[PDB]
């Protein structure tokens, strides 16, 4: 089957309504780039080795994917970037499920290729308008919560699996009362023998309302609605609505796009914020040669629907990887993101006012990382801590206070014109003076970085 | 080891976990708004200083989010002292009121700043 | 974080109620096997680098995953097989979504590992009983359809995307009237500008009823119910029920497990057979070093629910790969499958009467492959053709007749005591004598394999 | 087709149950008045050029419209007023949609006419009783709101389109807290990217409740429920009901009569006041020679249902036009309106206790117009301001206070026996003394009208 | 209210996502074409004679209709064709009701005009995709 002479069209001028795809192709030895890129386009559209009579009862050239360009990858050899264009008509309106089925449904198993990786997708404005997108989005969320001028703060309740409903609520209250905005249900925590969902929702609501009453600030707890069936999932969200809480949670990849879109629609119709966890993403997005890059999985979530989405951590990453992260963070928050291959952005993406998603940074984050995080992500982000709150010597509340004080010290310093990049450690040092909670959290750090301590007067 | 107080520690969002801003620090915050092209505005409240839920309890609904506007947003303001002057005038007229400074962004129809500037006695 | 001294437990005796996992680990240089296997167990359960106060309000040793064994891989170096045991309590009853979130949720992104691949899972009888499984299963399906003593036959309507509702139905009628049992909606075909779902369901029902009336045999067409939301998906199945048709279809990986379980439940309650397509599987299961092997994805489908599942083709595969396929085919059809590392079966799997799933063989299948397919798969299978029916010189019906005659010739020969392995080509040769349809389909094949032709008398 | 000898019946005595229509006809040159008026009656009833056999299976003279009178228009030549009578049986009970289809469905396109304009309709008591009419009406509304002895006050939130949900609510609170009774959603504001409906309803409810709590007076905000479908429209009203707010809004001409009647019924059953906006009316009612006069569109709204209806402004109009306005204002508020050609009232209209509709005056209204507005409209009216509140130098609240003080000064003066017609400017002058808010709003006006200012003591 | 200097933008390059409108304008005597076409654009979008404080809490130039071209009608005099461009964001997805309310809601009653007639509308692909359209359409109907 010589696809090259039908699916490889370098003269093709892409239309405003086309869905464009950037594939990183690693063809089998002997297989030319043009033929590999044509095999990719062919398999993900009409998929024909030759011709059958039914192909005459329509126009093949109307519904075919077209490889219009090939580019050799600067680094490794035997690796190319194939650009494919898909007609708007191939896709069902409002269905991320159909978009993924058409583009990544069968091509990754083609024999002529050794490895295949979808790097990016250009979602045209005409297809974007068929999606509801985030239930609320960054702006509406800040307005509902009445929180402005700083990153939001959250913490994970540990251990992951194991705690009872009442103990879970206790940790929720202690963390929230200390200065945190949100607490989190573990992604694995749904409904189990040690803790059934309804009891958890009930005690967590009691805990979050107490902390809100005590502090005077609006609180929220991501109540996991992920379930075995769509009916159970909705049944769980319905109870969150009855309790009057602000936010629910969902594991979009393990739950699935069909179920996630249903929940997102429900959340829009009922005023619930939707926190998304990316569990299982690394089985798909880790290897550089095979799979789907997270930036595509992030675009899919923004279309399907979610107000927050876990987007990893930037701590301990080479600029390089950091640039890739900032690349997809922009794709999630901004309305218009211009093409920029240096940050892994293969296409200019126009979101035509689709609400932006709040990126959630988590993973080994400590108070002394606050300066760098505040500078890198900016205000529109949610910074989540695990052992930085639970692992504080004095407990949850003092641990939450330490993180809240550290963050506000960074915000104040930034606003006063200080460079968070070079004065970071000093900013935390000064803050330790007026915060016993922050000081106790910085002990081991002071000994290594400052070779001491202390205070003076 | 110290215990975080369950009472008398009411907050007002951004910057409220830091020691009360000195007039100099309060002035630096206002200059950040101006440097970014944000329109400053003052809000004050005399009765409900914190959110509550009296009229409805559905998701996302809370009473007490809106405060009353002090005059008008200060468009074209270039001097941060003009803003600081209004805070003095506001607490002069309403000493028992909480006063906060908010900032508005135009590229975005949004508010993007909100910090307490004055708190009544015993707060 | 030294997991090894807490998560690596070689003295552990697995319980009848444990979920066991066989991971193929490729650790980073310097990282020991015991520590890597302990990192895998730790991350996919309690996930703690150290200790927080909440860990004392429960028993960590009660909800932790345990690496109880490590085995070096015979072939490559730096590759080990880590066996992990998970307590029954960590999982939500009846939820494949939760099972995948707990086991493959975060481990694939752990830094101490270079690559990770889930090879198998031992689902204990106590967890199996919390699932409905296939709506009907092999036996009930044959009884409903009144089809016994031979593989079932199906064909794909091509092109994949592009045809209109009435033309789609026309190809459906022509294929079915020729001897095929089932016709298939493309996995990409849901509801699009060129063909809306309801029109397709309506015309395909008319076509399948005509062919059934004409032939006297029960016919079916996999009507794709995959959609953007759960509500749309159910709405589509509801119409199939109103039309009184026998089978619907779903893309379980792109649609998702939460949505698939909902559809499966619906199908059981309404007497609909459920055909499952594995679109997107190759982005997860192709690479030998990273991902999830298809045998695990197949086990998950059997639990979530499906009566048929695409399981690739055996044509042109080394015994080797063929043995792996027969391995998962048994896991899908049989009640008890004993451990056998030669066929990639790491654990003995007891299905405690959960209905078996009918494997669907498709991909470059031609009439001359019939002998080998009938012998390898046996009667309990569905053999699907694409160009072997549509690409027949005389059209769909004669193409369907050729495949039906070829299959029955193989069944008859097998029953008469003939060896399909060595007499395969001869069996098809004899059949060409009494079938002009089969002869025309074997032209190019006769010239190469037999260097002729013909007939005599 | 000589209609004249069958449809022109000058001897006809109209029945108490007939629907009468007054058409302003401009026939083509050569076409006689009697023939033109007969063509109008014929086309809007039985519509027959000649005779077909089916006309004998009934009585044509039982369902035909009859032109019983022609009158030459005093002003222009070639312009006549044709009076047509329609049998009660031609109309579906309770359907304004059917009434408009029968009367104005095809006649405006008849060739024998150059232009046609429906000026008035006499709705007989027997047809009026088949309609629910306004959900509440003037009296019940004042009782629900506990507002008596003065016109009600409202203001528009500007800009029309563009503001976010929270900013919209802020302007709502500021206006309402200053003395206004109602605030208004723009007619264009439904649900858009910059502001989704549910967020608007939520923040506007918070704002109106705060202003009500602060002032001690009942407040309301017209929440626009206009939508693309009937289902969305009802879904929006349902949420307003859940929030417990007093009033919703609808664009009856762009939304349509079928949808408006549904909303009106919903509002009666759920205690919601219904504010009607007349968007698109000028494409129908502006030209004196062709279209439908607003008095007919107003009668239709009162039947279909609405508690308030925009009826333009009287500022800067010749008595003449002012008399026409007072004509339809009476038709909206009163129970019995006697024929009066000087005010454009072609027929005596008996409303048989159907609730009256509150007229809403808006369009370039300023504080100094208050005296004339209060005198012309009386207490039963709603006076809406745009830039008279938002454009006040000191903002929304002080702008609302200025309008409230100005209105009350006019009410007090009127009650004390003062002539608002000749003392208007002086009344506002005196009021400026005791109201800094009113003084600041009258600056430019004082300089022109009084050539100063000031105060004294 | 001098709309002309804010709503009449002959340098404007229409976007693929804009809703375009072709109005046949018959202005009142003395009223210039540029000012009439700007009055049409202004009234059917932001509709402001001057400025209020709320206009600063957003960007007026983001949600305004713009008259980008005027053309004299060959036949009659005092009749012009005004081309207006509306941002995609002004409209509710899938609602013809909202589209008509925004474009033809108030402009036909503006005083500076003697008569106004909407001749055509360019519905961009991005707005078309938010509608279901005909239940079946020509082809499906013939097939049924």
mmCIF file of C-alpha atoms in Angstrom, chain D residues 14-305:
data_model
loop_
_atom_site.group_PDB
_atom_site.id
_atom_site.type_symbol
_atom_site.label_atom_id
_atom_site.label_comp_id
_atom_site.label_asym_id
_atom_site.label_seq_id
_atom_site.Cartn_x
_atom_site.Cartn_y
_atom_site.Cartn_z
ATOM 1 C CA UNK D 14 -70.736 43.399 13.984
ATOM 2 C CA UNK D 15 -71.361 40.815 16.707
ATOM 3 C CA UNK D 16 -70.249 41.038 20.342
ATOM 4 C CA UNK D 17 -68.047 38.005 19.714
ATOM 5 C CA UNK D 18 -66.253 39.284 16.572
ATOM 6 C CA UNK D 19 -62.569 40.211 16.455
ATOM 7 C CA UNK D 20 -62.437 43.569 14.657
ATOM 8 C CA UNK D 21 -59.426 44.903 12.790
ATOM 9 C CA UNK D 22 -58.609 48.428 11.611
ATOM 10 C CA UNK D 23 -56.194 48.334 8.668
ATOM 11 C CA UNK D 24 -54.548 51.390 7.085
ATOM 12 C CA UNK D 25 -54.600 50.419 3.384
ATOM 13 C CA UNK D 26 -52.520 51.951 0.567
ATOM 14 C CA UNK D 27 -53.825 50.207 -2.596
ATOM 15 C CA UNK D 28 -52.019 49.950 -5.925
ATOM 16 C CA UNK D 29 -53.107 52.547 -8.534
ATOM 17 C CA UNK D 30 -56.405 51.622 -10.155
ATOM 18 C CA UNK D 31 -57.450 49.286 -7.353
ATOM 19 C CA UNK D 32 -60.671 50.633 -5.719
ATOM 20 C CA UNK D 33 -60.963 50.962 -1.889
ATOM 21 C CA UNK D 34 -63.875 48.515 -1.641
ATOM 22 C CA UNK D 35 -61.900 45.918 -3.596
ATOM 23 C CA UNK D 36 -58.730 46.512 -1.550
ATOM 24 C CA UNK D 37 -60.573 46.191 1.758
ATOM 25 C CA UNK D 38 -62.255 43.030 0.482
ATOM 26 C CA UNK D 39 -58.868 41.603 -0.555
ATOM 27 C CA UNK D 40 -57.617 42.235 3.003
ATOM 28 C CA UNK D 41 -60.610 40.434 4.555
ATOM 29 C CA UNK D 42 -60.474 37.574 2.047
ATOM 30 C CA UNK D 43 -56.754 36.853 2.404
ATOM 31 C CA UNK D 44 -56.866 36.871 6.222
ATOM 32 C CA UNK D 45 -59.692 34.302 6.517
ATOM 33 C CA UNK D 46 -60.905 31.906 3.796
ATOM 34 C CA UNK D 47 -58.584 33.248 1.080
ATOM 35 C CA UNK D 48 -60.259 32.126 -2.143
ATOM 36 C CA UNK D 49 -59.887 33.694 -5.589
ATOM 37 C CA UNK D 50 -62.810 31.559 -6.843
ATOM 38 C CA UNK D 51 -64.449 28.270 -5.752
ATOM 39 C CA UNK D 52 -63.402 24.630 -5.217
ATOM 40 C CA UNK D 53 -65.695 21.675 -4.355
ATOM 41 C CA UNK D 54 -64.605 21.564 -0.683
ATOM 42 C CA UNK D 55 -66.243 24.975 -0.117
ATOM 43 C CA UNK D 56 -69.616 23.253 -0.422
ATOM 44 C CA UNK D 57 -68.897 20.821 2.420
ATOM 45 C CA UNK D 58 -69.178 23.795 4.831
ATOM 46 C CA UNK D 59 -70.593 27.352 4.821
ATOM 47 C CA UNK D 60 -68.120 29.926 3.473
ATOM 48 C CA UNK D 61 -70.188 32.778 4.962
ATOM 49 C CA UNK D 62 -69.610 31.330 8.452
ATOM 50 C CA UNK D 63 -65.793 31.530 8.612
ATOM 51 C CA UNK D 64 -65.088 34.512 6.383
ATOM 52 C CA UNK D 65 -63.569 37.828 7.398
ATOM 53 C CA UNK D 66 -65.748 40.751 6.303
ATOM 54 C CA UNK D 67 -64.767 44.301 5.376
ATOM 55 C CA UNK D 68 -67.812 46.160 6.663
ATOM 56 C CA UNK D 69 -66.520 49.716 6.369
ATOM 57 C CA UNK D 70 -64.026 51.937 4.545
ATOM 58 C CA UNK D 71 -62.930 55.435 5.567
ATOM 59 C CA UNK D 72 -60.702 57.816 3.662
ATOM 60 C CA UNK D 73 -57.762 59.147 5.670
ATOM 61 C CA UNK D 74 -58.038 62.922 6.206
ATOM 62 C CA UNK D 75 -54.342 63.577 5.607
ATOM 63 C CA UNK D 76 -52.801 61.654 2.703
ATOM 64 C CA UNK D 77 -54.603 60.463 -0.411
ATOM 65 C CA UNK D 78 -54.556 56.821 -1.593
ATOM 66 C CA UNK D 79 -54.752 55.862 2.091
ATOM 67 C CA UNK D 80 -57.889 54.322 3.599
ATOM 68 C CA UNK D 81 -58.909 52.670 6.866
ATOM 69 C CA UNK D 82 -60.549 49.289 6.245
ATOM 70 C CA UNK D 83 -62.565 47.700 9.066
ATOM 71 C CA UNK D 84 -62.669 43.898 9.048
ATOM 72 C CA UNK D 85 -64.719 41.529 11.224
ATOM 73 C CA UNK D 86 -63.566 37.982 12.026
ATOM 74 C CA UNK D 87 -65.751 35.207 13.528
ATOM 75 C CA UNK D 88 -64.812 34.008 17.031
ATOM 76 C CA UNK D 89 -64.464 30.433 15.696
ATOM 77 C CA UNK D 90 -61.452 31.186 13.509
ATOM 78 C CA UNK D 91 -59.256 31.471 16.599
ATOM 79 C CA UNK D 92 -57.648 29.022 18.979
ATOM 80 C CA UNK D 93 -58.433 29.795 22.595
ATOM 81 C CA UNK D 94 -55.539 31.308 24.552
ATOM 82 C CA UNK D 95 -53.192 31.541 21.564
ATOM 83 C CA UNK D 96 -51.851 34.970 20.529
ATOM 84 C CA UNK D 97 -49.706 33.011 18.071
ATOM 85 C CA UNK D 98 -52.827 31.836 16.209
ATOM 86 C CA UNK D 99 -54.465 35.268 16.366
ATOM 87 C CA UNK D 100 -51.452 36.874 14.673
ATOM 88 C CA UNK D 101 -51.147 34.056 12.112
ATOM 89 C CA UNK D 102 -54.778 34.453 11.000
ATOM 90 C CA UNK D 103 -54.878 38.249 10.853
ATOM 91 C CA UNK D 104 -51.362 39.273 9.781
ATOM 92 C CA UNK D 105 -50.198 35.976 8.270
ATOM 93 C CA UNK D 106 -50.485 36.624 4.524
ATOM 94 C CA UNK D 107 -52.243 39.947 3.763
ATOM 95 C CA UNK D 108 -49.175 42.197 3.987
ATOM 96 C CA UNK D 109 -47.796 40.533 0.877
ATOM 97 C CA UNK D 110 -50.870 40.937 -1.323
ATOM 98 C CA UNK D 111 -50.080 42.528 -4.701
ATOM 99 C CA UNK D 112 -53.147 44.778 -4.999
ATOM 100 C CA UNK D 113 -51.757 46.742 -2.039
ATOM 101 C CA UNK D 114 -48.669 48.965 -1.977
ATOM 102 C CA UNK D 115 -48.521 49.089 1.823
ATOM 103 C CA UNK D 116 -50.579 47.761 4.727
ATOM 104 C CA UNK D 117 -50.625 48.630 8.419
ATOM 105 C CA UNK D 118 -52.639 47.036 11.247
ATOM 106 C CA UNK D 119 -53.591 49.955 13.501
ATOM 107 C CA UNK D 120 -55.866 48.338 16.086
ATOM 108 C CA UNK D 121 -57.825 45.234 17.085
ATOM 109 C CA UNK D 122 -61.009 44.886 19.116
ATOM 110 C CA UNK D 123 -60.584 41.825 21.326
ATOM 111 C CA UNK D 124 -64.087 40.761 22.419
ATOM 112 C CA UNK D 125 -64.704 39.689 26.048
ATOM 113 C CA UNK D 126 -65.425 36.100 24.923
ATOM 114 C CA UNK D 127 -61.878 35.745 23.518
ATOM 115 C CA UNK D 128 -60.241 37.698 26.381
ATOM 116 C CA UNK D 129 -61.534 35.144 28.911
ATOM 117 C CA UNK D 130 -59.508 32.368 27.263
ATOM 118 C CA UNK D 131 -56.243 34.070 28.316
ATOM 119 C CA UNK D 132 -54.545 34.156 31.685
ATOM 120 C CA UNK D 133 -53.045 37.571 30.955
ATOM 121 C CA UNK D 134 -50.402 39.141 33.246
ATOM 122 C CA UNK D 135 -49.005 36.760 35.891
ATOM 123 C CA UNK D 136 -49.933 39.335 38.543
ATOM 124 C CA UNK D 137 -50.744 42.816 37.243
ATOM 125 C CA UNK D 138 -50.452 46.325 38.712
ATOM 126 C CA UNK D 139 -52.445 45.904 41.933
ATOM 127 C CA UNK D 140 -51.049 42.531 43.058
ATOM 128 C CA UNK D 141 -47.543 43.729 42.207
ATOM 129 C CA UNK D 142 -47.801 46.828 44.416
ATOM 130 C CA UNK D 143 -49.168 44.586 47.195
ATOM 131 C CA UNK D 144 -46.365 42.025 46.859
ATOM 132 C CA UNK D 145 -43.765 44.800 46.857
ATOM 133 C CA UNK D 146 -45.566 46.984 49.420
ATOM 134 C CA UNK D 147 -45.027 50.088 47.288
ATOM 135 C CA UNK D 148 -47.767 52.735 46.962
ATOM 136 C CA UNK D 149 -48.266 56.404 46.097
ATOM 137 C CA UNK D 150 -45.546 56.936 43.508
ATOM 138 C CA UNK D 151 -44.003 55.712 40.246
ATOM 139 C CA UNK D 152 -41.496 52.880 40.675
ATOM 140 C CA UNK D 153 -37.838 53.503 39.827
ATOM 141 C CA UNK D 154 -35.403 51.400 37.838
ATOM 142 C CA UNK D 155 -32.017 51.725 36.169
ATOM 143 C CA UNK D 156 -30.060 49.997 33.440
ATOM 144 C CA UNK D 157 -26.634 48.483 34.089
ATOM 145 C CA UNK D 158 -24.178 49.713 31.440
ATOM 146 C CA UNK D 159 -22.403 48.844 29.212
ATOM 147 C CA UNK D 160 -25.098 46.730 27.509
ATOM 148 C CA UNK D 161 -22.811 43.780 26.774
ATOM 149 C CA UNK D 162 -19.355 43.285 28.253
ATOM 150 C CA UNK D 163 -19.354 43.139 32.063
ATOM 151 C CA UNK D 164 -18.582 40.044 34.159
ATOM 152 C CA UNK D 165 -21.015 38.419 36.618
ATOM 153 C CA UNK D 166 -19.445 39.860 39.759
ATOM 154 C CA UNK D 167 -19.017 43.385 38.351
ATOM 155 C CA UNK D 168 -22.619 43.239 37.134
ATOM 156 C CA UNK D 169 -23.740 42.434 40.674
ATOM 157 C CA UNK D 170 -21.628 45.272 42.114
ATOM 158 C CA UNK D 171 -23.405 47.889 39.964
ATOM 159 C CA UNK D 172 -26.719 46.242 40.931
ATOM 160 C CA UNK D 173 -26.021 46.640 44.648
ATOM 161 C CA UNK D 174 -24.790 50.252 44.338
ATOM 162 C CA UNK D 175 -27.859 51.347 42.304
ATOM 163 C CA UNK D 176 -30.423 49.542 44.450
ATOM 164 C CA UNK D 177 -28.937 50.705 47.770
ATOM 165 C CA UNK D 178 -29.365 54.307 46.655
ATOM 166 C CA UNK D 179 -33.157 54.353 46.433
ATOM 167 C CA UNK D 180 -34.084 52.513 43.244
ATOM 168 C CA UNK D 181 -36.617 49.691 43.327
ATOM 169 C CA UNK D 182 -35.348 47.725 40.329
ATOM 170 C CA UNK D 183 -32.194 47.157 38.273
ATOM 171 C CA UNK D 184 -32.213 45.711 34.772
ATOM 172 C CA UNK D 185 -30.433 42.989 32.822
ATOM 173 C CA UNK D 186 -29.766 44.214 29.337
ATOM 174 C CA UNK D 187 -32.091 42.616 26.775
ATOM 175 C CA UNK D 188 -28.990 41.268 24.965
ATOM 176 C CA UNK D 189 -27.593 39.804 28.173
ATOM 177 C CA UNK D 190 -28.673 36.134 28.267
ATOM 178 C CA UNK D 191 -25.694 33.782 28.535
ATOM 179 C CA UNK D 192 -22.372 34.532 26.827
ATOM 180 C CA UNK D 193 -18.595 33.853 27.084
ATOM 181 C CA UNK D 194 -18.022 37.004 29.176
ATOM 182 C CA UNK D 195 -20.865 36.166 31.560
ATOM 183 C CA UNK D 196 -22.825 32.931 31.857
ATOM 184 C CA UNK D 197 -26.429 33.211 33.081
ATOM 185 C CA UNK D 198 -26.191 31.181 36.284
ATOM 186 C CA UNK D 199 -23.247 33.185 37.622
ATOM 187 C CA UNK D 200 -25.158 36.387 36.900
ATOM 188 C CA UNK D 201 -28.320 35.174 38.643
ATOM 189 C CA UNK D 202 -26.222 34.114 41.646
ATOM 190 C CA UNK D 203 -24.276 37.385 42.106
ATOM 191 C CA UNK D 204 -27.282 39.603 41.333
ATOM 192 C CA UNK D 205 -29.298 37.805 44.008
ATOM 193 C CA UNK D 206 -26.508 38.413 46.540
ATOM 194 C CA UNK D 207 -26.379 42.100 45.557
ATOM 195 C CA UNK D 208 -30.129 42.699 45.693
ATOM 196 C CA UNK D 209 -30.468 40.998 49.106
ATOM 197 C CA UNK D 210 -27.686 43.132 50.573
ATOM 198 C CA UNK D 211 -29.292 46.378 49.315
ATOM 199 C CA UNK D 212 -32.668 45.233 50.656
ATOM 200 C CA UNK D 213 -31.160 44.452 54.064
ATOM 201 C CA UNK D 214 -29.357 47.810 54.104
ATOM 202 C CA UNK D 215 -32.320 49.976 53.052
ATOM 203 C CA UNK D 216 -35.297 48.147 54.526
ATOM 204 C CA UNK D 217 -37.180 48.338 51.199
ATOM 205 C CA UNK D 218 -38.024 45.454 48.869
ATOM 206 C CA UNK D 219 -35.677 45.247 45.870
ATOM 207 C CA UNK D 220 -35.769 43.444 42.551
ATOM 208 C CA UNK D 221 -33.551 42.835 39.538
ATOM 209 C CA UNK D 222 -34.991 41.809 36.152
ATOM 210 C CA UNK D 223 -33.100 38.569 35.512
ATOM 211 C CA UNK D 224 -33.246 37.888 31.756
ATOM 212 C CA UNK D 225 -34.551 34.385 31.050
ATOM 213 C CA UNK D 226 -34.666 34.804 27.236
ATOM 214 C CA UNK D 227 -32.966 31.794 25.603
ATOM 215 C CA UNK D 228 -32.493 29.708 22.470
ATOM 216 C CA UNK D 229 -35.071 27.074 23.434
ATOM 217 C CA UNK D 230 -38.142 26.784 25.681
ATOM 218 C CA UNK D 231 -36.369 24.268 27.889
ATOM 219 C CA UNK D 232 -33.415 26.615 28.571
ATOM 220 C CA UNK D 233 -35.797 29.511 29.214
ATOM 221 C CA UNK D 234 -37.754 27.555 31.857
ATOM 222 C CA UNK D 235 -34.528 26.160 33.344
ATOM 223 C CA UNK D 236 -33.406 29.764 33.945
ATOM 224 C CA UNK D 237 -36.688 30.837 35.574
ATOM 225 C CA UNK D 238 -36.565 27.707 37.800
ATOM 226 C CA UNK D 239 -33.246 28.876 39.273
ATOM 227 C CA UNK D 240 -34.655 32.384 39.901
ATOM 228 C CA UNK D 241 -37.437 30.621 41.840
ATOM 229 C CA UNK D 242 -34.890 28.605 43.837
ATOM 230 C CA UNK D 243 -33.073 31.839 44.768
ATOM 231 C CA UNK D 244 -36.377 33.333 45.930
ATOM 232 C CA UNK D 245 -36.056 36.527 43.875
ATOM 233 C CA UNK D 246 -39.159 38.534 42.858
ATOM 234 C CA UNK D 247 -38.857 39.168 39.145
ATOM 235 C CA UNK D 248 -37.603 37.719 35.851
ATOM 236 C CA UNK D 249 -37.393 39.192 32.344
ATOM 237 C CA UNK D 250 -38.156 38.221 28.743
ATOM 238 C CA UNK D 251 -37.788 39.676 25.244
ATOM 239 C CA UNK D 252 -41.239 38.687 23.952
ATOM 240 C CA UNK D 253 -40.806 39.542 20.258
ATOM 241 C CA UNK D 254 -37.414 37.935 19.662
ATOM 242 C CA UNK D 255 -38.243 35.080 22.038
ATOM 243 C CA UNK D 256 -41.723 34.751 20.572
ATOM 244 C CA UNK D 257 -45.339 34.530 21.749
ATOM 245 C CA UNK D 258 -45.384 30.742 22.194
ATOM 246 C CA UNK D 259 -42.365 30.900 24.520
ATOM 247 C CA UNK D 260 -43.646 34.052 26.291
ATOM 248 C CA UNK D 261 -47.025 32.510 27.114
ATOM 249 C CA UNK D 262 -45.174 29.483 28.559
ATOM 250 C CA UNK D 263 -43.025 31.731 30.757
ATOM 251 C CA UNK D 264 -46.036 33.809 31.833
ATOM 252 C CA UNK D 265 -47.879 30.623 32.893
ATOM 253 C CA UNK D 266 -44.775 29.511 34.796
ATOM 254 C CA UNK D 267 -44.550 32.911 36.517
ATOM 255 C CA UNK D 268 -48.207 32.784 37.648
ATOM 256 C CA UNK D 269 -47.741 29.262 39.046
ATOM 257 C CA UNK D 270 -44.553 30.235 40.877
ATOM 258 C CA UNK D 271 -45.175 33.802 42.042
ATOM 259 C CA UNK D 272 -42.621 35.536 39.813
ATOM 260 C CA UNK D 273 -43.184 39.004 38.387
ATOM 261 C CA UNK D 274 -42.522 39.196 34.643
ATOM 262 C CA UNK D 275 -40.765 42.207 33.102
ATOM 263 C CA UNK D 276 -41.140 42.441 29.326
ATOM 264 C CA UNK D 277 -38.681 44.133 26.951
ATOM 265 C CA UNK D 278 -39.896 45.074 23.464
ATOM 266 C CA UNK D 279 -36.661 44.466 21.520
ATOM 267 C CA UNK D 280 -37.152 44.373 17.724
ATOM 268 C CA UNK D 281 -40.450 46.289 17.851
ATOM 269 C CA UNK D 282 -39.226 49.157 15.636
ATOM 270 C CA UNK D 283 -38.644 46.869 12.639
ATOM 271 C CA UNK D 284 -42.396 46.245 12.782
ATOM 272 C CA UNK D 285 -43.964 49.432 14.225
ATOM 273 C CA UNK D 286 -41.985 52.471 13.012
ATOM 274 C CA UNK D 287 -43.230 53.245 9.483
ATOM 275 C CA UNK D 288 -46.669 54.874 9.320
ATOM 276 C CA UNK D 289 -47.559 53.116 6.074
ATOM 277 C CA UNK D 290 -46.460 49.514 6.635
ATOM 278 C CA UNK D 291 -46.416 47.172 9.617
ATOM 279 C CA UNK D 292 -48.196 46.833 12.946
ATOM 280 C CA UNK D 293 -48.652 49.716 15.348
ATOM 281 C CA UNK D 294 -47.283 49.242 18.847
ATOM 282 C CA UNK D 295 -50.782 49.436 20.361
ATOM 283 C CA UNK D 296 -51.557 46.033 18.814
ATOM 284 C CA UNK D 297 -48.225 44.575 19.966
ATOM 285 C CA UNK D 298 -49.048 45.925 23.440
ATOM 286 C CA UNK D 299 -52.503 44.329 23.440
ATOM 287 C CA UNK D 300 -50.905 41.022 22.440
ATOM 288 C CA UNK D 301 -48.439 41.237 25.329
ATOM 289 C CA UNK D 302 -51.197 41.936 27.854
ATOM 290 C CA UNK D 303 -53.026 38.826 26.618
ATOM 291 C CA UNK D 304 -49.945 36.590 26.345
ATOM 292 C CA UNK D 305 -48.684 37.824 29.695
#
